[PDB]
Amino acid sequence: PISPIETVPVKLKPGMDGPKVKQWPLTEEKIKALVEICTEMEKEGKISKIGPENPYNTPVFAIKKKDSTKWRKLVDFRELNKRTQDFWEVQLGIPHPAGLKKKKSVTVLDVGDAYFSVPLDEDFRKYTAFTIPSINNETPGIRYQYNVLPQGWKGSPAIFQSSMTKILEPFRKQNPDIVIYQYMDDLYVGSDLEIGQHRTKIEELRQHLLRWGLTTPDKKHQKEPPFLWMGYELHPDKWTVQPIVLPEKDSWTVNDIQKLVGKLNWASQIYPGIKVRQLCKLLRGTKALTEVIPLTEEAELELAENREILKEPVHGVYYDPSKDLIAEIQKQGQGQWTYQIYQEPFKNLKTGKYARMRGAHTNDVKQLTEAVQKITTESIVIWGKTPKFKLPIQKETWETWWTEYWQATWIPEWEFVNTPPLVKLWYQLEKEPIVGAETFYVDGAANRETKLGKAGYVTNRGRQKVVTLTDTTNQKTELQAIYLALQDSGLEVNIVTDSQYALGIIQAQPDQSESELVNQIIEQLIKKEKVYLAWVPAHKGIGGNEQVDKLVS
Amino acid sequence: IETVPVKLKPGMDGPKVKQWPLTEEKIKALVEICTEMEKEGKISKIGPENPYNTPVFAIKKSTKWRKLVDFRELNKRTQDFWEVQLGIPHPAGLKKKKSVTVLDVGDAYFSVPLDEDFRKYTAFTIPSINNETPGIRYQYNVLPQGWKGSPAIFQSSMTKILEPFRKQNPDIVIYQYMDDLYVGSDLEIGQHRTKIEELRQHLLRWGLTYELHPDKWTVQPIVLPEKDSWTVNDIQKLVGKLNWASQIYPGIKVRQLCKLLRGTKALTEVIPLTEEAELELAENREILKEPVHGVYYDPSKDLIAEIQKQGQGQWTYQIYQEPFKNLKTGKYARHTNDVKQLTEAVQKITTESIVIWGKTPKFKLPIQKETWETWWTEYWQATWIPEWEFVNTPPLVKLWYQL
Ligand SMILES: CCCn1c(C(=O)c2cc(C)cc(C#N)c2)c(C(C)C)c(=O)[nH]c1=O
């Protein structure tokens, strides 16, 4: 049918007029095909013969489906698209399974000829005018316009979705104890009634759609669980991803490895502890898709763990609105984090995996704070509330970080759980100068053209030293001078610099870096006992600043 | 009543800002509220043919969920209108007044119809959890709170409404900024409060049902330590600080003090003071106390605000248009929630900013974008929303404004 529902007013973009593409002349079998379709369509009410005045045209085409002997009508709305208004998003975000409440009763309902069952803005049909050429293109062709929503037009998915929503509305108000999920042109219906009173309202629902143009599958034509969907496999009281098979190959091409990383990432939302770092290092470079990549030791070790975790099947449970959500996070490796959400231990609603790094230098406390946030937003999206957290970090560790760090920060309600590795601060810089500790005044520099570089220091006990660096930047040297002061000093040292740069880096208490130097500066800072870092203005003639400043050039 | 025709800025299109995820409690709240004002006909459901969108969410101002709309995008896309075509002039007298009370008059806009052909630009979406259903979409039919056009379009009515009260108290300053009325007088506080109540009654006959003290506003001057003993370390700090200050204040001198730091001394060593140095030190304090010479407000230019976390629930901030030309600086103090406090400071600073310049500043916030974006809505209880970007505080900036 063609639903009675009001139409949605459509416009074209404001400075624009509708399409006028020329019809490409079509062979004879294609002309015959299009006639056979379009007459059957105007019988159904879907289109209508017009006669020019109508100046508009979108080209037509017929294709063979595609070993069978059936044909199909393709329209190239390419241009009417371009000239049509933007619509609202048909749907932004799709439901995550782990967000679903368990249901007593489930039925899937499937709209038929959905787009063609919905009227097109009468004022707009004129722009849909298309034209079937005559044989060897000699006479005036047959010219139709759409009455319903054309397959492949810009406005159709939005307008259909909208129409299915106004039509479901009165029934939703009346049947609030029942959930309908609209995805594309399907419907999913669940309630906590018994199969009887369920199919009672199911039919009662179909007979509501039917008053409105919408024809559906009856009792005899409804699929049963699992309802594979969108990558998931959905059962009556639990869910999992669709079955994942890791290929078995001797050679791996870049394309074999990208597909694997994906299938793993997908598994990662219900299979705890999946890793992909070692496999991802592999993709770096400028290779083609056909290039075979020899797996590293650590990648194979890693494909191994993954190969095992996936061996036995795992499932996720459904959401019980009357319990708290509990999120558990573990440091799983070098900047890699894994988490689990559950309400009753340890039956997970879902699992997940955090791997980003923020900046060139972070420490675990920072990285852990970023995961909490990431996990928090996610929870808002899937369940509408934030979880109780359980983190591998003492309250005192966190409390010492928050307080002394300059950024504002905050995680919601959490608890320490002893799941090593624990996260700790790896060194504290002193808040005051050390006494009887050798004060190094360090400095570094570089010729912007030569790219030559000197880094050195002068101390108050008369020591000096200045090494040379080849092709280094004015700021690389400044870290070097500090690495320097740290190599050549005892377990306690004051260090003075003019680099706000170096300052900033070190005062952040990094514990990993995208820098070799900074990684070494770090391991030193670890080995020390007290270290006090201090900044001074360059070129003001301050302290021993001027001295070492001369040693370098 | 006849609707003022509203145009966007030339060429540019309306807001397409997507809706942030909301908590079930805020969603329910919004559903009620909106079901209500649709009955009353303030908003109507809209279809997919409206491409536009701006975020909404719920706050608590009192324990009655209010509905807030982020019209920042719309505001920028309309700002020929609320600035140059109409325009509510700022009184320089407001900051001078002994007491200023801020009144919410946004309920006033809900009476005036909105230009038919502008309404599509006010579309918002109440989202759904786990994307279970499509959001519920609405546009406005009346002037919306939060939009800079509503006070601009309602100016003629506000003047009429306020006209008698102004005539009867010609020495009282009343400013309108967005959803708020600002009322300043020099009266003793009881008389002042009494005068506000008279005002409410006038307001009350048209459907319009806290106290600043702007005088008590002064610089958070750059603070130079006074010390029993100075170590080299303490001198170097002192030089750093003055070396900063000299980019802002003219006259700043350092020389007599750097003299002290010749050679390579241990940091923890005590250097006694020069008669010159101590003379310098004082005249610097003279300068630091005073407002920057040569720094002036340019109404054609954006206000910027920067905030440093000082620890101990202390927060320093400066406002300026060209970096280091500070129009003013201050501190804000005293839950040990970092984000709660920051949110409070942003509102306070924005408030002062409106009173002095009729402008909100763009804020540079010392916090991870994502952290701030998750949480700020839990503590925001103001009716406008300023612009913000996110910034790592340079370790030196923070200390130079230390207290
Ligand atoms: C049957 C258990 C899953 N389930 C569903 C549901 O069946 C469903 C859900 C989604 C998002 C997609 C698909 C598909 N394909 C099916 C529902 C429906 C009625 C929303 C439910 O409420 N609870 C539930 O456990």
In angstroms, the separation between the Cα of residue A428 and the nearest Cα of chain B is 16
CATH of domain B93-117+159-211: 3.30.70.270
| Chain B residue with Cα closest to A91 | B134
Classify A408 as helix, strand or coil.
Answer: strand
Cβ proximity of A118 and A212 under 8 Å: no
Burial of A57 per CB tally in 10 Å (0-12, 13-18, 19+)? buried
Q: How far apart are the first and last CA of chain A?
A: 86
Burial of A90 per CB tally in 10 Å (0-12, 13-18, 19+)? middle
**Contact at CB, B337 and A460, closer than 8 angstroms:** no
Q: Does the A226-319 domain belong in CATH 3.40.50.300?
A: no
For domain A320-426, give the fold: Alpha-Beta Plaits (3.30.70)
Ligand 1 centroid–CA A139 distance in Å is 54
Ligand 1 centroid–CA A100 distance in Å is 7
What is the β-pairing status of strands A70-75 and A105-110? Answer: unpaired
Helix (H) or strand (E) holding B99: strand B99-104
Which residues from B are below 8 Å from A537, CB to CB?
Answer: 239-240, 243
Which CA distances in Å does A173 have to A170, A196, B71, B131? 5, 21, 31, 19
Neighbour tally for B390: CB within 10 Å: 16
Q: Is B129 on the interface with A (CB under 8 A)?
A: yes
Classify B169 as helix, strand or coil.
Answer: coil
**Contact at CB, B309 and A380, closer than 8 angstroms:** no
Cβ proximity of A21 and A58 under 8 Å: yes
Of residues A233, A237, A253, A305, the one with CA closest to residue A276: A305
CATH superfamily, domain at A427-552: Ribonuclease H-like superfamily/Ribonuclease H (3.30.420.10)
**Contact at CB, A158 and B308, closer than 8 angstroms:** no
Residue A318 Cα: closest atom of ligand 1: 25
Which residues from B are below 8 Å from A432, CB to CB?
Answer: 233
Could you state, in order of their start, the residue ranges of all structural domains in chain A?
A: 1-90+116-156, 91-115+157-225, 226-319, 320-426, 427-552
**Contact at CB, A435 and B372, closer than 8 angstroms:** no
Query: How many beta-carbon pairs under 8 angstroms link A with B?
Result: 194
A11-70 residues touching B, CB cutoff 8 A: 11
Identity of the residue in A87, A162, A504 whose CB atom sits nearest the CB atom of B394: A504
Cβ proximity of B187 and B99 under 8 Å: yes
Residue type, A510: P
Which CA distances in Å does A120 have to A58, A75, A152, B178? 16, 16, 13, 42
Residue A230 Cα: closest atom of ligand 1: 15
CA distance A498 to B12: 47
CA distance B277 to B254: 8
Burial of B127 per CB tally in 10 Å (0-12, 13-18, 19+)? buried
Which residues from A are below 8 Å from B309, CB to CB?
Answer: 406-408
Query: CATH topology of A91-115+157-225 equal to that of A427-552?
Result: no
SS (HEC) of A112-130: CCHHHHCECCHHHHHHHCE
Which residues from A are below 8 Å from B236, CB to CB?
Answer: 496, 534, 536, 542-543
SS (HEC) of B323-370: CCCEEEEEEEECCCCHHHHHHHHHHHHHHHHHHHHCCCCEEEECECHH
CATH of domain A91-115+157-225: 3.30.70.270
Alpha carbons within 13 angstroms on the beta-carbon side of residue A373 total 18
Residue nearest to atom 8 of ligand 1 (CA): A188
Pocket residue to mutate for ligand 1, from A181, A230, A320, most atoms within 8 A of Cβ: A181
Cβ proximity of A145 and A47 under 8 Å: yes
- The answer to whether B179 is a known ligand-binding residue is yes
Of residues B79, B86, B76, the one with CA closest to residue B159: B86
- What is the C-alpha R_g of chain B? 25
In angstroms, the separation between the Cα of residue A535 and the nearest Cα of chain B is 8
- The architecture of the domain spanning B212-297 is 2-Layer Sandwich (3.30)
- The architecture of the domain spanning B298-400 is 2-Layer Sandwich (3.30)
Of residues A447, A247, A389, A89, the one with CA closest to residue B123: A89
Alpha helices in B139-298 (DSSP H): 149-168, 189-204, 232-245, 255-258, 275-289
Site residues for ligand 1, CB cut-off 6 Å: A 95, 100-103, 106, 179, 181, 188-190, 225, 227, 229, 234, 236, 318
User: How many angstroms from the chain centroid is the CA of residue A513?
Assistant: 25
Cβ proximity of B258 and A536 under 8 Å: no
Q: Is B402 on the interface with A (CB under 8 A)?
A: no
Cβ proximity of B298 and B358 under 8 Å: no
User: Would you state the structure tokens that stand for residue B45, as one six-digit string?
Assistant: 């459901």
Q: How far apart are the first and last CA of chain B?
A: 56
CA distance A286 to A124: 49
Q: Any idea what DSSP says for residue B259?
A: T
Sheet holding B180-185, edge to edge: B173-177, B180-185, B99-104, B211-212
User: Would you state the structure tokens that stand for residue B365, as one six-digit string?
Assistant: 């916030």
Which residues from A are below 8 Å from B131, CB to CB?
Answer: 91-95, 381
Identity of the residue in B18, B47, B398 whose CB atom sits nearest the CB atom of A8: B47
CATH of domain A1-90+116-156: 3.10.10.10
User: How many angstroms from the chain centroid is the CA of residue B309?
Assistant: 18
Q: Any idea what DSSP says for residue A100?
A: P
Neighbour tally for A312: CB within 10 Å: 7
A329's CB contacts (< 8 A; 6+ apart) are: A337, A338, A339, A368, A371, A372, A375, A389, A390, A391, A392
CATH of domain B5-92+118-158: 3.10.10.10
**Contact at CB, B130 and A542, closer than 8 angstroms:** no
Q: Is B390 on the interface with A (CB under 8 A)?
A: no
Of residues B134, B161, B101, B124, the one with CA closest to residue B50: B124
Q: Is A386 on the interface with B (CB under 8 A)?
A: yes
Cβ proximity of A216 and A112 under 8 Å: yes
CA distance B72 to A462: 61
Q: Any idea what DSSP says for residue B85?
A: I
Residue nearest to atom 25 of ligand 1 (CA): A102
Cβ proximity of A544 and A441 under 8 Å: yes
| Chain B residue with Cα closest to A88 | B51
A453's CB contacts (< 8 A; 6+ apart) are: A444, A445, A446, A447, A468, A469, A470, A471, A472, A473, A474, A476, A477, A480
Which residues from A are below 8 Å from B23, CB to CB?
Answer: 380, 384-386
Ligand 1 centroid–CA A190 distance in Å is 7
Classify A260 as helix, strand or coil.
Answer: helix
Resolution of the experimental structure, in angstroms? 2.8
**Contact at CB, A88 and B396, closer than 8 angstroms:** no
A291's CB contacts (< 8 A; 6+ apart) are: A253, A254
Q: Any idea what DSSP says for residue B108?
A: G
Residue nearest to atom 15 of ligand 1 (CA): A229
| Chain A residue with Cα closest to B243 | A537
Helix (H) or strand (E) holding A258: helix A254-267
User: Would you state the structure tokens that stand for residue B295, as one six-digit string?
Assistant: 């720094």
In angstroms, the separation between the Cα of residue B345 and the nearest Cα of chain A is 12
CA distance A267 to A274: 8
